[PDB]
Amino acid sequence: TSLEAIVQNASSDNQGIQLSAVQAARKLLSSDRNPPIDDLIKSGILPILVHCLERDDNPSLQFEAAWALTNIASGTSEQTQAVVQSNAVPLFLRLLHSPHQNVCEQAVWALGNIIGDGPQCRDYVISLGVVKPLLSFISPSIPITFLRNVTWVMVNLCRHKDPPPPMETIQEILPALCVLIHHTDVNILVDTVWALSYLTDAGNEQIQMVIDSGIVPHLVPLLSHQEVKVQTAALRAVGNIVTGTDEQTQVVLNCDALSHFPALLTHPKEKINKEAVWFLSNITAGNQQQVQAVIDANLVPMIIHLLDKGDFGTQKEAAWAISNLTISGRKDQVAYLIQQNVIPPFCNLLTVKDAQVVQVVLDGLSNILKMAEDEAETIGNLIEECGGLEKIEQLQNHENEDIYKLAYEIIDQFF
Amino acid sequence: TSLEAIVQNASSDNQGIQLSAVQAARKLLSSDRNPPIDDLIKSGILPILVHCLERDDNPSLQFEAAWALTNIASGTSEQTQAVVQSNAVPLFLRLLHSPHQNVCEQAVWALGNIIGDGPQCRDYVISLGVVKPLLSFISPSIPITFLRNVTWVMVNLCRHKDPPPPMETIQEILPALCVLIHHTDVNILVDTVWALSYLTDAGNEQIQMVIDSGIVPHLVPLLSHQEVKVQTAALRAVGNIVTGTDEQTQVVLNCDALSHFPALLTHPKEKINKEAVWFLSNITAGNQQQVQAVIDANLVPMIIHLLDKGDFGTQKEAAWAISNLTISGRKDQVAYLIQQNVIPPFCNLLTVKDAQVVQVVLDGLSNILKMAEDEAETIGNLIEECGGLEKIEQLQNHENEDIYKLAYEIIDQFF
Amino acid sequence: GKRKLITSEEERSPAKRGRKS
Amino acid sequence: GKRKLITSEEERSPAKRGRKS
């Protein structure tokens, strides 16, 4: 009856009783980190809350109902969907233009939770026209607390890739990200770059739109930002770009991206080490001049070091970086690899339980021997000298057909 | 026009031509990591591939069509959905008992991709009865490559939490997980434990089902498995369980769980350090006996060391672990923290950008001073000697109202 | 006092947020 | 040769897998 009385009092003609009841509902949803959302929905309070959103004559009541609806929309998809089905979104879009700042901001917060539910709720709110008035809040005078909520909604607008947001929405969001990437607040900068990382993870056409925005020269130097939160997001965003074409990759390289990577391969955090090698693996998958840029940047010995001593996640990306180079590189670039003693630590990975890593190393060794027309003898002994030949022989006993067939063909052709 | 010809030939009365056409379609989907799924869907080949699944008179064609449909279902949700709307699932389910092993396995693979799309497709395949014949494949004679695909589908049956799988499905899966957790293959062990981690992240009632299965005494010792992939999955699974009630937490503790954590707190991997402290923070949020078990296991000095010298992700969990203890512990248990020199590294976190961490530390300091009846003076001196008092005073000017109000209350009450 | 584990993606970019009191 | 970034959850538990040639 406590919940039932609160619902009845939320429709009271007495304004003091009505405001107190909506507050009591809000506090049930905000007093702890396990709110009773389903109980309040079944009590019948949703249509009353959506209804208080129209009370322009009582801003205090509008604010409390928007707060209560914000927390209901923060729950499961079914609970977020109940707020949608109550037709609250058109009223939240109304309140973006409220003269009262706390009402306007809470409506942004509520819409962000609905947008964050998934692509279909995102596209419903987009269809009603949320993006333009949202970006209109970006101004010199906006409070910093409010702007952090605005950039959080922008992240939610970019974050679902199945499907990505419509192209028109991306073309509206990108000029706003170009403004925000120069902000000195760390949280806004982190959100801005994560938003870019979601847009660059959406395919090559979206990558080109990010490039055409002109934002890449202002993104690459963030690889050496003091804050590791910014570095991690920037490494992800530029890492996604270099998954595109050779030209798109060259744009990132022409912003001096490789200069930042000595400090990234030696960074304290293993996660940055792994993503940095993953980045480089996509450069050694490029053309021969991009392979040469990695060589000229003196990054190969640091890759081979992590291939040997790094954690298994990083060693895995390092094997890809080496194996990619054996497919794209010239003979003199692969010879540079042999001179840097890639053979022993490369072969040491042949005994791991990850069948993909074993296949990557076997593919690389096959390409190395096929490429060294005259020096295949020297390389063949180097492989046996470190115990690699013994490991190739036992991989003939492997469960995977692609692996044991390649082990057979390697020994027949070169041993 | 080659695509149109392949589609035409896929309906040929000439069995050689039909098999080659379906093969050519499969090849387009399997020859690289960027298959043209949309082109094949638009070509009209889906209902022809589905009809090939009915050809019990040609197992080779059945296998090739199942492989082709497997890869279409491995794409976007709309592409997985196009296979569903072609009514392929009932035919895949009847192919689970084909006399031909390769046809059977490929049907399991295709169904796993549909289940992996989301909860709605998962429940559709469950509604048609996939779980029982899937688990019937678990036997002493099953080839290990097939078993890894069965356990992967079992992971996909457990992986979505909005909503979780039906209770009836979980009760069917748990006895299979009890069998597989004794397997010696690492990949099957890792899949089995990750499936448990998904089930234990689904709420306290699913946690009780996992406990009632009797599998916890066989999960906890995997915290010290030789393979770090197993340790990581096991730490996640037992970590989810201790997010439940005090009784559910005590089940894990009575399996000697805390004896594994010295090696987890000093492990080379930072992520193991962080999630191990997260585990311990949920133990210090328990009753006073569980707080005492952490003290008796000699873990507090190791927590305080990581609070001082760990990466920031681990420092946050350590701040939670200390702050949780100040709420639940006795006075002699909090006094033990002071003797273990908690004050300096605890206060040193007051200057981080994470507003949640600052709130956590202020809450802990306030709780410490309130429970030190006479020793509030000694502790107040310790807080100022390390610079903590200076940091609390400047937090009175913080942009967060919860933070600066508590900063004032601490100074008003104790300084 | 119990806290569920938040993934790395939800750590730096939480999809949904309730406003706490 | 280009490889997209696979999350930590999808590395140890991929939701969808195609069979490659």
Numbering used by the authors:
A (entry chain B), B (entry chain A): 71 to 485
C (entry chain C), D (entry chain D): 1666 to 1686
Question: How does the study describe this entry?
Answer:
53BP1 (TP53-binding protein 1), a key player in DNA double-strand break repair, has a classical bipartite nuclear localization signal (NLS) of sequence 1666-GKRKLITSEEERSPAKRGRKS-1686 that binds to importin-α, a nuclear import adaptor protein. Nucleoporin Nup153 is involved in nuclear import of 53BP1, and the binding of Nup153 to importin-α has been proposed to promote efficient import of classical NLS-containing proteins. Previous studies have shown that Nup153 is involved in nuclear import of 53BP1 and that the interaction between Nup153 and importin-α is required for efficient nuclear import of classical NLS-containing proteins. It has been proposed that the extreme C-terminus of Nup153 binds directly to importin-α.
Here, the ARM-repeat domain of human importin-α3 bound to 53BP1 NLS was crystallized in the presence of a synthetic peptide corresponding to the extreme C-terminus of Nup153 (sequence: 1459-GTSFSGRKIKTAVRRRK-1475). The crystal diffracted X-rays to 1.9 Å resolution, and the structure was solved by molecular replacement. The asymmetric unit contained two molecules of importin-α3 and two molecules of 53BP1 NLS. Although no convincing density was observed for the Nup153 peptide, the electron density corresponding to 53BP1 NLS was unambiguous and continuous along the entire length of the bipartite NLS. The structure revealed a novel dimer of importin-α3, in which two protomers of importin-α3 are bridged by the bipartite NLS of 53BP1. In this structure, the upstream basic cluster of the NLS is bound to the minor NLS-binding site of one protomer of importin-α3, whereas the downstream basic cluster of the same chain of NLS is bound to the major NLS-binding site of another protomer of importin-α3. However, no convincing density was observed for the Nup153C peptide. This quaternary structure of importin-α3–53BP1 NLS complex is distinctly different from the previously reported crystal structure of mouse importin-α1–53BP1 NLS complex, in which one molecule of 53BP1 NLS is bound along the concave surface of one molecule of importin-α1. • Although the quaternary structure reported here could be an artifact of the crystallization process, the data enriches structural database of what can happen during crystallization of protein-peptide complexes, and will benefit researchers interested in protein crystallization.
